[PDB]
Amino acid sequence: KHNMKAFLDELKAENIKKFLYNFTQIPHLAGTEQNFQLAKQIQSQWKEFGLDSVELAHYDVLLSYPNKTHPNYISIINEDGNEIFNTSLFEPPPPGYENVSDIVPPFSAFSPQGMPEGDLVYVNYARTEDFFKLERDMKINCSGKIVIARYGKVFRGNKVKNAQLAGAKGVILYSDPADYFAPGVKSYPDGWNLPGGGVQRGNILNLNGAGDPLTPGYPANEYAYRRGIAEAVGLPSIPVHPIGYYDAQKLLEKMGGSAPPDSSWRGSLKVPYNVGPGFTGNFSTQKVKMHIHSTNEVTRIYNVIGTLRGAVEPDRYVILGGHRDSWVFGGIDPQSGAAVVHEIVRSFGTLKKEGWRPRRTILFASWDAEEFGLLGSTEWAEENSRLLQERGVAYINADSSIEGNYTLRVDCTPLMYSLVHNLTKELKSPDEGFEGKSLYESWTKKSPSPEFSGMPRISKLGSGNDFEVFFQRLGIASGRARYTKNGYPLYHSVYETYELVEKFYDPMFKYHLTVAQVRGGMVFELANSIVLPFDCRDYAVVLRKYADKIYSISMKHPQEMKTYSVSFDSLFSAVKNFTEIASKFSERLQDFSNPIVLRMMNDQLMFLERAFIDPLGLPDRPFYRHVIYAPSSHNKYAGESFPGIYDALFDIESKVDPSKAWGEVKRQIYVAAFTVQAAAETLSEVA
Amino acid sequence: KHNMKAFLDELKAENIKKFLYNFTQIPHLAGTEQNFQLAKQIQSQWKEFGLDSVELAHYDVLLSYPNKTHPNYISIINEDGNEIFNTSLFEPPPPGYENVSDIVPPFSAFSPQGMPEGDLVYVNYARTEDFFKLERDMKINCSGKIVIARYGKVFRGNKVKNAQLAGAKGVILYSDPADYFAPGVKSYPDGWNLPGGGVQRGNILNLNGAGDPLTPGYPANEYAYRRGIAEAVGLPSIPVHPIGYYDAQKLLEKMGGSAPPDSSWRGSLKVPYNVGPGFTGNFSTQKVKMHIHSTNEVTRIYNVIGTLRGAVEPDRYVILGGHRDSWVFGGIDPQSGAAVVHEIVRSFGTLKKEGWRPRRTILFASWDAEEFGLLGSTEWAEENSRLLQERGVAYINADSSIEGNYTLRVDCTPLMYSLVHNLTKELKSPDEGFEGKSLYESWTKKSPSPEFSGMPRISKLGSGNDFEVFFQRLGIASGRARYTKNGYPLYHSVYETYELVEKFYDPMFKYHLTVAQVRGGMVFELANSIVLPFDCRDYAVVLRKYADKIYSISMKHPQEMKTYSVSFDSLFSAVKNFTEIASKFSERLQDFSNPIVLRMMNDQLMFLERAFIDPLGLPDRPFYRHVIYAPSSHNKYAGESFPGIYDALFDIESKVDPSKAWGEVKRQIYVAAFTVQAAAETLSEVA
Numbered sequence A, B: 001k002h003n004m005k006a007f008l009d010e011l012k013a014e015n016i017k018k019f020l021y022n023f024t025q026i027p028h029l030a031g032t033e034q035n036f037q038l039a040k041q042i043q044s045q046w047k048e049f050g051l052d053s054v055e056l057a058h059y060d061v062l063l064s065y066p067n068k069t070h071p072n073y074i075s076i077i078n079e080d081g082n083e084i085f086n087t088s089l090f091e092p093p094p095p096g097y098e099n100v101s102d103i104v105p106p107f108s109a110f111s112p113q114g115m116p117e118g119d120l121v122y123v124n125y126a127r128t129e130d131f132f133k134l135e136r137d138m139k140i141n142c143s144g145k146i147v148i149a150r151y152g153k154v155f156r157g158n159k160v161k162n163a164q165l166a167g168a169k170g171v172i173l174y175s176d177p178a179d180y181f182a183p184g185v186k187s188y189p190d191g192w193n194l195p196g197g198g199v200q201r202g203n204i205l206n207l208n209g210a211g212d213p214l215t216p217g218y219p220a221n222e223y224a225y226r227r228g229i230a231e232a233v234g235l236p237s238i239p240v241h242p243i244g245y246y247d248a249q250k251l252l253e254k255m256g257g258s259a260p261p262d263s264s265w266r267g268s269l270k271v272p273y274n275v276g277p278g279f280t281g282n283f284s285t286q287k288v289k290m291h292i293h294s295t296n297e298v299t300r301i302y303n304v305i306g307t308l309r310g311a312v313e314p315d316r317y318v319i320l321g322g323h324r325d326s327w328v329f330g331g332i333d334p335q336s337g338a339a340v341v342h343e344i345v346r347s348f349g350t351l352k353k354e355g356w357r358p359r360r361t362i363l364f365a366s367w368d369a370e371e372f373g374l375l376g377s378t379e380w381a382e383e384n385s386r387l388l389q390e391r392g393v394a395y396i397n398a399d400s401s402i403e404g405n406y407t408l409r410v411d412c413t414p415l416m417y418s419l420v421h422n423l424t425k426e427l428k429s430p431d432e433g434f435e436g437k438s439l440y441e442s443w444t445k446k447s448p449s450p451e452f453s454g455m456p457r458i459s460k461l462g463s464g465n466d467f468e469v470f471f472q473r474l475g476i477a478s479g480r481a482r483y484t485k486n487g488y489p490l491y492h493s494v495y496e497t498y499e500l501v502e503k504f505y506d507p508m509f510k511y512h513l514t515v516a517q518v519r520g521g522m523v524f525e526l527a528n529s530i531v532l533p534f535d536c537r538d539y540a541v542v543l544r545k546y547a548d549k550i551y552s553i554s555m556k557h558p559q560e561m562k563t564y565s566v567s568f569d570s571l572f573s574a575v576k577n578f579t580e581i582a583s584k585f586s587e588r589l590q591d592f593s594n595p596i597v598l599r600m601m602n603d604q605l606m607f608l609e610r611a612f613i614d615p616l617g618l619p620d621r622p623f624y625r626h627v628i629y630a631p632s633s634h635n636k637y638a639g640e641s642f643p644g645i646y647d648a649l650f651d652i653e654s655k656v657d658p659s660k661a662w663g664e665v666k667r668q669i670y671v672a673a674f675t676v677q678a679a680a681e682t683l684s685e686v687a
């Protein structure tokens, strides 16, 4: 038979291993010839595997690269202008790769050019609360200073935005061993830790879902009109550069000024973690100087788009997508995910060659330029937004399959919770000590739900990956799954190789296979189940949780709620109505031979995520349109619930016009209550 | 049998007459008790007639009324401050209505309060080109002047916007007999002309599709957060008041200053039509003083929403809607349309009582507060936008059925052209001299298409009526039809009564019946045809016409097109692609027992109008989202094609930064080409 088990059994760990090796021998940086050749290879193989059509979709988008003949670096400069210490020009390459060409040196993509010279201030993780502590509590002024911040906790673009708004004239990012060196594990190549010369690449944009900085709203096709660079979206205004902890130590060790305020500001280096500004007495006339000469350049990128046409509902799309571009070899990010997609395509294709087709159309995507701001997925979604709007059932992401070997991690819309619980109960756990047990059992034991006994944790989607446009802009039900730790030290470094994965993460490729089963099984059910496998009642449960949560934040300010008559009554009423209507819809869904009633009901299911979209967007973030979830304004990686109300309440005690600020809280309560009620009403009887 | 002919034959002229009489005995001003009682009556009758459900949908929106104890008027004031002439406080009521209560005196709805005193400038119709002529050619400065303008040619809100931007401190609107008194016809009550004491009421907002001024984007429900009045949408900044031509004569007769520039500035009164500013020598120290004391007031309004559930596709909606509120008796506007809707509901209900149901759901609407800015339709569409987005097949408007007795007038999306041609070929002409001939024959003879031999004229939709939110905001295929002249003199005056219609417009009610057949027949076909009755190829034809037209406007500036490399190549390419893809889709539609392929194809048809929506809206007009059509920025009543490019090109030779201005033309070309190609691609094979 051709059923989910046939699909799942055809997936092989050895194939995933072979593909991973194949995808990680040379760098595949977005916009480079190497990455275009890999696109062509994947296109050819997906055709061979049996897809109906496989095309490249190309766009010309703003990318950023160092200047090969004018390298980026940082100095300590003495009184006379002599550079007495320089940061590294490259990471020492790993064994056997010391002759590999085209390894991009560490840099922060989209940094402007400059050579700012000044006194250092250490800003911990450069989070919003770190700058509050500096400016409000310690009375330390970052204006015209170079800020040094440790990576971790939040997306690096938010750090740079925060430093810019504090008045910094440059930002140095570094990896502290506190955050990137696990106790008792050896550095690469003898373990999975970050050596002192390792450095994390990565973009520092604040795009808020715009896609290519030059063409917000529209695909960057051949005739696109482009904004000028001065009007581009999300570019930083000050130079930024990342360094490793050997180099950071040399920059921090001389720091003077104020002591760190408490232990949460101290990393693991043998330095005092003084905040500054500037260096201690003997070195007070020394300064730090950045030299950044990277350039932004409109460059062609290529997505591979494969189609497996549905037998019954070809105009309903289930999308499995993940990126292909990498900073260097992409041993984990993204090729551990891409190899899994490749094996999934191969397995679906095996069934297709035997005469099977899924009920709905499956689209498979190899996205380009994810690392430069989700550019490939976002431009393609901008190009196809009307098709996706009206036909998109679900999007399953497929970036890195493993970031650890401890347990599963799933982030998804509440509409997929039941699907994920049911699927994982039917899959075998790959975990030691759980042989013969289900993946649901091992996952639930290792990652318990905070609210429910005998249930696993499932997180909210934020951003920082290619589902963003589908979920937060377009309102298509989205999910992701990968293996995780109890992100990882070698992230975006030259050391993230095939050998890292094969030796230290997943020698048997069993965690990769488990992830392929989860992602592939979700796609299979979404594309083949007669009734779409979404449970609207799970959204009702979470909406009440989120409403309780946002009300509790507001209730920290009882006097103001009294003064400005701030009531959450409408939001709770809408949530209550959603719960009631969803229950009734579930009864009809269970109780309804009529394909029109079925499809009518499948359309109600498909458009339910869509109903949470507000076509006016969130305040000053027009491409974040989902009213229940948005990426946190303080950390793109984290999801925030009722974001419009959350941001209206955030730090509200500091606003100079409380009447206006509380007015805006009330406005956001009304928008949220209305959107919840409107979404509920899409589940009512249609006439 | 239950077919379209059964539906059409059940419609009766005598019923339409009885309903019109019933709806026009007392005023039904929006927000008044009288109009709530009429809503309740219609609700009850639609239930009796056989609809499945009939509900009131109420909202609390900003309305505007004169102050009953502090009347609005205008004076000529002499040097000493004595008011030597005053305009009328009311229109002399028509025979037999001189004791009717609650006739709102003439006023301009949403005028602010004030008592500005100053010198008059006469501005013709206060169109954009009239102000260009004044300021650029005649060097006449309106700043701090009271402007007097004749009604006609463009929506009165645009006149007020233009006067405000010219610096006027007040606007007086009047009806010139040149525009409102047909030669050889008697004034009311002995003919259909406007007497010298008649006055046109009407709102002067510039809402650009926002709906209630206080709640743009969201329905004005019980918990709505409202903007403060200073942030409200579309309110005028200067006092405005309308007067009749006896009073206008007294204001114009003393005008001095410059002569009218040419004959197109002269009306039919026995005055020189001097532009001013101010009065001739002997009266130079006299001024004009306005006294406006109207108030804006949040007020409850009520739409009646009736549902006839579809037998096969209950989740597809065909909507027949028209307003119920009137300025006074609403003899033509809107009750000539409302009486027709009422008879249409009655006829559909007769079929339903015999066991028939339409294939798709039909929704019937009696909208409130249309006269105050399309408020009732727009708030309801804001409330139900997700249902309408995903389920709305078509909207047929049903305001005034007759504005003349000469011929039919149809304005609609190209998607309905074929439907309208086919339907009118099957209806009898009511016209004298065409007995036994089709309505298509009489209409085509009287109103020939400018481009095609043996075809009738069909115009573009703009705004100024309740289809606006459905078509220009939401992208639901929309149409309207009414009888017209070869708008009308008594428009918005107390004289627009039942007797006006019965005596002078349509004594036999045959034109009303013809309009009921056209509107009802369109609804019947849209709700019952197996394949939706839309021909995408008709959109291809018009898109080429519009592209030729916009290119021709640009080509008035060859040097600039050379300098800034302004090419329309992408737009023509997209139009060519649309034409090709539409042709292929039509072949499949004709060539495809499979209800999924059918519904898949019906969905492609339904979402084709939807594909012309840009979720970012047009520049500075976020609620006008259709890229092919928008209401003209100079005249809300008129439709403009490729509005984004049109407005970018308009008066471009006057812009101080030609590089920036031509850059924006190129941007709008890209948006238009992309949207046309994207809409075309919705008609491609789906996978």
Ligand SMILES: *[C@@H]1O[C@H](CO)[C@@H](O[C@@H]2O[C@H](CO)[C@@H](O[C@@H]3O[C@H](CO)[C@@H](O)[C@H](O[C@H]4O[C@H](CO)[C@@H](O)[C@H](O)[C@@H]4O)[C@@H]3O)[C@H](O)[C@H]2NC(C)=O)[C@H](O)[C@H]1NC(C)=O
Residues within 6 Å of the ligand: A570, A571, A573, A574, A577, A673, A674, A677, B222
């Ligand atoms: C959740 O679903 C419930 C339906 O089960 C829905 O209930 C609706 O609530 C509204 C707002 O409370 C009700 O609105 C009232 O409607 C009546 C007419 O039916 C009006 O007369 C009321 O207005 C008077 O009272 C107001 C409040 O004191 C005054 O401000 C006002 O000036 C009037 O005096 C009022 O508008 C509505 O009838 C019910 N609908 C039902 C029961 O069917 C509720 O709104 C949903 N929640 C959300 C967030 O949408």
Ligand SMILES: *[C@@H]1O[C@H](CO)[C@@H](O[C@@H]2O[C@H](CO)[C@@H](O[C@@H]3O[C@H](CO)[C@@H](O)[C@H](O[C@H]4O[C@H](CO)[C@@H](O)[C@H](O)[C@@H]4O)[C@@H]3O)[C@H](O)[C@H]2NC(C)=O)[C@H](O)[C@H]1NC(C)=O
Residues within 6 Å of the ligand: A222, B570, B571, B573, B574, B577, B673, B674, B677
């Ligand atoms: C109307 O439909 C047609 C399809 O029938 C569609 O044609 C497409 O046009 C685009 C733009 O002209 C073509 O794009 C080219 O694609 C190739 C790869 O296939 C590229 O190599 C080309 O880029 C090179 O040349 C450019 C122009 O000189 C340079 O600027 C560039 O740097 C490169 O050197 C180019 O991107 C596309 O292939 C066709 N697609 C087809 C034929 O299938 C057309 O776009 C549609 N009209 C609209 C408005 O969408």
Ligand SMILES: *[C@@H]1O[C@H](CO)[C@@H](O[C@@H]2O[C@H](CO)[C@@H](O[C@@H]3O[C@H](CO)[C@@H](O)[C@H](O)[C@@H]3O)[C@H](O)[C@H]2NC(C)=O)[C@H](O)[C@H]1NC(C)=O
Residues within 6 Å of the ligand: A418, A419, A422, A532, A533, A534, A535, A590, A591
């Ligand atoms: C995840 O798995 C669960 C457990 O199988 C699924 O729930 C079960 O769904 C079935 C089919 O809808 C329900 O069966 C129905 O039972 C009622 C009797 O009350 C009957 O009227 C229907 O004809 C049908 O037999 C069953 O009750 C339900 N079990 C539960 C909720 O415990 C669930 O749907 C799966 N989730 C997915 C597919 O997203």
Ligand SMILES: *[C@@H]1O[C@H](CO)[C@@H](O[C@@H]2O[C@H](CO)[C@@H](O[C@@H]3O[C@H](CO)[C@@H](O)[C@H](O)[C@@H]3O)[C@H](O)[C@H]2NC(C)=O)[C@H](O)[C@H]1NC(C)=O
Residues within 6 Å of the ligand: B418, B419, B422, B532, B533, B534, B535, B590, B591
């Ligand atoms: C308006 O009326 C016209 C005239 O009847 C409709 O056009 C006609 O539509 C029919 C049905 O689709 C076409 O018949 C088809 O003919 C082809 C043979 O080429 C065959 O393959 C199909 O099986 C079917 O018989 C007919 O050709 C066509 N006539 C024309 C275009 O002159 C039109 O569809 C109506 N418009 C509406 C309903 O919106």
Ligand SMILES: *[C@@H]1O[C@H](CO)[C@@H](O[C@@H]2O[C@H](CO)[C@@H](O)[C@H](O)[C@H]2NC(C)=O)[C@H](O)[C@H]1NC(C)=O
Residues within 6 Å of the ligand: A021, A022, A023, A025, A040, A041, A044, A045
């Ligand atoms: C990755 O695998 C691909 C597919 O097997 C390899 O590309 C093939 O290489 C052979 C030998 O050079 C050619 O004859 C084929 O035409 C290629 N097939 C394609 C591109 O579809 C590629 O060599 C492998 N890369 C690495 C580093 O092992």
Ligand SMILES: *[C@@H]1O[C@H](CO)[C@@H](O[C@@H]2O[C@H](CO)[C@@H](O)[C@H](O)[C@H]2NC(C)=O)[C@H](O)[C@H]1NC(C)=O
Residues within 6 Å of the ligand: A067, A068, A069, A070, A295
């Ligand atoms: C990258 O840096 C190089 C090396 O400094 C730049 O090349 C120089 O450009 C200037 C003109 O601005 C020439 O006069 C020099 O002769 C060049 N030097 C060398 C060694 O080639 C180059 O412009 C930079 N590339 C960019 C900014 O894209």
Ligand SMILES: *[C@@H]1O[C@H](CO)[C@@H](O[C@@H]2O[C@H](CO)[C@@H](O)[C@H](O)[C@H]2NC(C)=O)[C@H](O)[C@H]1NC(C)=O
Residues within 6 Å of the ligand: A081, A082, A083, A084, A085, A086
């Ligand atoms: C850090 O790097 C800089 C740049 O290469 C070095 O400074 C240069 O030294 C050369 C050779 O002595 C001079 O001719 C250049 O003018 C210097 N350039 C600048 C910008 O100062 C510097 O010596 C290096 N410092 C260390 C400690 O290695």
Ligand SMILES: *[C@@H]1O[C@H](CO)[C@@H](O[C@@H]2O[C@H](CO)[C@@H](O)[C@H](O)[C@H]2NC(C)=O)[C@H](O)[C@H]1NC(C)=O
Residues within 6 Å of the ligand: B021, B022, B023, B025, B040, B041, B044, B045
């Ligand atoms: C308009 O017609 C309606 C419906 O026939 C009339 O309202 C009815 O009036 C009678 C007698 O007063 C009542 O017994 C009914 O209850 C009413 N029916 C309703 C409201 O549905 C109304 O009188 C007519 N108005 C005019 C001016 O003729």
Ligand SMILES: *[C@@H]1O[C@H](CO)[C@@H](O[C@@H]2O[C@H](CO)[C@@H](O)[C@H](O)[C@H]2NC(C)=O)[C@H](O)[C@H]1NC(C)=O
Residues within 6 Å of the ligand: B067, B068, B069, B070, B295
């Ligand atoms: C309408 O105009 C009346 C009449 O001038 C206003 O009523 C007066 O309001 C003032 C307070 O502002 C009182 O002191 C007077 O006694 C009132 N006069 C009379 C004759 O009643 C009224 O405010 C206006 N209504 C509005 C603005 O809604």
Ligand SMILES: *[C@@H]1O[C@H](CO)[C@@H](O[C@@H]2O[C@H](CO)[C@@H](O)[C@H](O)[C@H]2NC(C)=O)[C@H](O)[C@H]1NC(C)=O
Residues within 6 Å of the ligand: B081, B082, B083, B084, B085, B086
């Ligand atoms: C126009 O109307 C005004 C307001 O009613 C009249 O002026 C008033 O006249 C009365 C009685 O003589 C005075 O007590 C008021 O003080 C006046 N009010 C104002 C605002 O001036 C005026 O007489 C009328 N003019 C004509 C020609 O009828």
Ligand SMILES: O=C(O)CC[C@H](NP(=O)(O)OCCNC(=O)c1ccccc1)C(=O)O
Residues within 6 Å of the ligand: A202, A203, A333, A370, A371, A372, A373, A374, A399, A462, A463, A464, A465, A487, A636, A637, A638
């Ligand atoms: O520009 C962007 O938005 C992201 C680009 C790029 N994405 P990528 O490195 O491939 O993946 C980020 C890894 N982390 C996650 O996906 C994540 C998200 C939420 C919670 C925990 C982890 C980056 O973070 O630099």
Ligand SMILES: O=C(O)CC[C@H](NP(=O)(O)OCCNC(=O)c1ccccc1)C(=O)O
Residues within 6 Å of the ligand: B202, B203, B333, B370, B371, B372, B373, B374, B399, B462, B463, B464, B465, B487, B636, B637, B638
């Ligand atoms: O606020 C609005 O947009 C319009 C309100 C109100 N609409 P209403 O008087 O009922 O109908 C306007 C009549 N003219 C049209 O509909 C029309 C539209 C396009 C071309 C020719 C005529 C008005 O024009 O004052």
Ligand SMILES: *[C@@H]1O[C@H](CO)[C@@H](O)[C@H](O)[C@H]1NC(C)=O
Residues within 6 Å of the ligand: A141, A142, A143, A144
């Ligand atoms: C920080 O420093 C600059 C002076 O160089 C000043 O303009 C700015 O206002 C300072 N901010 C605070 C909070 O002291």
Ligand SMILES: *[C@@H]1O[C@H](CO)[C@@H](O)[C@H](O)[C@H]1NC(C)=O
Residues within 6 Å of the ligand: A192, A404, A405, A485, A504, A505
């Ligand atoms: C794999 O799991 C083992 C056992 O818990 C652990 O020692 C090792 O650190 C894990 N590898 C990685 C990369 O986390």
Ligand SMILES: *[C@@H]1O[C@H](CO)[C@@H](O)[C@H](O)[C@H]1NC(C)=O
Residues within 6 Å of the ligand: B141, B142, B143, B144
């Ligand atoms: C119109 O009049 C005022 C002077 O009262 C002046 O400020 C304004 O600039 C004038 N405009 C022109 C074009 O002369």
Ligand SMILES: *[C@@H]1O[C@H](CO)[C@@H](O)[C@H](O)[C@H]1NC(C)=O
Residues within 6 Å of the ligand: B192, B404, B405, B485, B504, B505
């Ligand atoms: C009705 O038609 C007749 C004949 O052409 C004409 O004399 C009359 O003016 C028309 N009535 C109206 C209101 O247009």
